[PDB]
Amino acid sequence: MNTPKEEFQDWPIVRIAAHLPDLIVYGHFSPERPFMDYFDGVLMFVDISGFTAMTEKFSSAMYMDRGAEQLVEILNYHISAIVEKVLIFGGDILKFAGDALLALWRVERKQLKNIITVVIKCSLEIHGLFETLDIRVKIGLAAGHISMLVFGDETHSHFLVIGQAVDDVRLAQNMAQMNDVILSPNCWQLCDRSMIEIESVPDQRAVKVNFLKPPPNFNFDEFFTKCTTFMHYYPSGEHKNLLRLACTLKPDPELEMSLQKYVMESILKQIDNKQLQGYLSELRPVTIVFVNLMFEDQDKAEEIGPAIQDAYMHITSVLKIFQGQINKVFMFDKGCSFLCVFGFPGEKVPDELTHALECAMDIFDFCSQVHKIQTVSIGVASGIVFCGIVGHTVRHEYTVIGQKVNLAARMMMYYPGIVTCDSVTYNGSNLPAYFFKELPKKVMKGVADSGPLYQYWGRT
Ligand SMILES: Nc1ncnc2c1ncn2[C@@H]1O[C@H](COP(=O)(O)CP(=O)(O)OP(=O)(O)O)[C@@H](O)[C@H]1O
Ligand SMILES: Nc1nc(Cl)cc(N(Cc2cccs2)C2CC2)n1
Ligand SMILES: [Ca+2]
Ligand SMILES: [Cl-]
């Protein structure tokens, strides 16, 4: 009696799970919103520098109308290797944003020291990989208490990690010069100092890792194996050949119903083999509306959660009306940011610019009265941006990369408390000139040639 091979592996639920971390896939939590949970772990924020420039070049005529296809190929060639390293070291990729990704090793408080060692080794191996396009990799690490927030409505869900360690990992990474790994202060405080050769960062309690220098008896693989005891989802045994346990998920309509809420409809359409895979990789004219919600420095996560929930409910209704989408949500330095996009798969209109501006003002007016939100700032920029699925086969997300994305994000930070827009949006809108005010030109870090910027004043 024959015993033929292959556990079938490519169910819709498995494909959906590629778009989510284990934190969500295996989360089994309440469907109330907001939902908050608390844990400890180590974070790694890996930020590639140089794909936004590569993006601009790939629109040129030399790429012969295949710039999006070539961009996404070369990006994924590099990012998929990084993702594999993270997964093999036992980490959970939480979210992608353009050419960056945030990863988490959730562990019990007693294991933080040991896990920091595993994550530093992983970081050094990620720097390893890149002795090969013009691109640097900056890595920040942090460790400590982390809170998870899940917010949404009955058909959509969104998550974030929050707290000092999240702020710290971002601050750490941002200090790295090309190809450095930086530890947060608390990470350096908790780590195994005998193993880890560091140096001062000027005007900073963070430190740069110079070397991993283990003792005589230390064998990394035996050490790593012991650390796997504390990793709940590390593929093992008959599944040690897999990069994720999520590859073994079996059909379960209730779990699927829950996971699909995190993923865009156009992505679900591709997952369901109702649209061609290549259709979502594009260099497409869009309008980016980047909305920043600032909370007071005193604010704790249990106050932040209901306020993001409230803002979200309004953002989503306004976007539905004006034909916009939330591409990604971020939070650090007391600012929760919604990266919103007008134009992309299906939603292409003619009055898109007018609509992005009115939508932005509606969001600004509503969110300004949400209890606990100190300041709303919204940057609006229009241009050619790369849209597509970034990452590895087993762990990837839809995202956007482009100069106008970065510009919108810089506007919102440099021109706080107002709605700002770029020249393309200004000249291209229906609207008369006195709806606007021309702004003083600020020198913006990582932005040159930016052109005239405007405040969207409104009808009044
Ligand atoms: N998705 C993201 N989430 C959080 N912070 C980000 C981010 N992208 C960039 N940043 C932060 O802002 C800092 C400056 O980023 P920038 O210099 O403006 C673009 P980059 O990340 O260097 O290269 P790039 O745009 O080719 O990819 C970063 O070092 C990082 O701390
Ligand atoms: N707060 C938060 N949560 C998640 Cl899950 C991701 C995220 N971001 C922004 C941050 C990067 C570094 C610390 S927070 C990642 C996807 C870019 N921010
Ligand atoms: Ca980047
Ligand atoms: Cl891949």
UniProtKB/Swiss-Prot annotation:
It is found in: Cell membrane; Cytoplasm, Cytoskeleton; Cytoplasm, Perinuclear region; Nucleus. Mg(2+) 1 binds at D47, D99. Hydrogencarbonate binds at K95, V161, R170, M331. Cleavage may occur to generate the active 48 kDa form. ATP binds at D47, I48, S49, G50, F51, T52, D99, K138, V400, N406, L407, A408, A409, R410. Residues 42-173, 287-412 form the Guanylate cyclase domain. Mg(2+) 2 binds at D47, I48, D99. It comes from the Eukaryota. Detected in airway epithelial cells and testis (at protein level). Weakly expressed in multiple tissues. Expressed in brain, heart, kidney, liver, lung, pancreas, peripheral blood leukocytes, placenta, skeletal muscle, stomach, thymus, airway epithelial cells, duodenum, jejunum and ileum. Very low level of expression in bone. Belongs to the adenylyl cyclase class-4/guanylyl cyclase family. The N-terminal guanylate cyclase domains are required for enzyme activity. Fragments or isoforms containing the first 470 amino acid residues are fully active. It is linked to Hypercalciuria absorptive 2: A common type of hypercalciuria, a condition characterized by excessive urinary calcium excretion. Absorptive hypercalciuria is due to gastrointestinal hyperabsorption of calcium and is a frequent cause of calcium oxalate nephrolithiasis. Catalyzes the formation of the signaling molecule cAMP. May function as sensor that mediates responses to changes in cellular bicarbonate and CO(2) levels. Has a critical role in mammalian spermatogenesis by producing the cAMP which regulates cAMP-responsive nuclear factors indispensable for sperm maturation in the epididymis. Induces capacitation, the maturational process that sperm undergo prior to fertilization. Involved in ciliary beat regulation. This is Adenylate cyclase type 10. It comes from Homo sapiens (Human). The chain holds residues 1 to 466 of 1610 of the full protein.
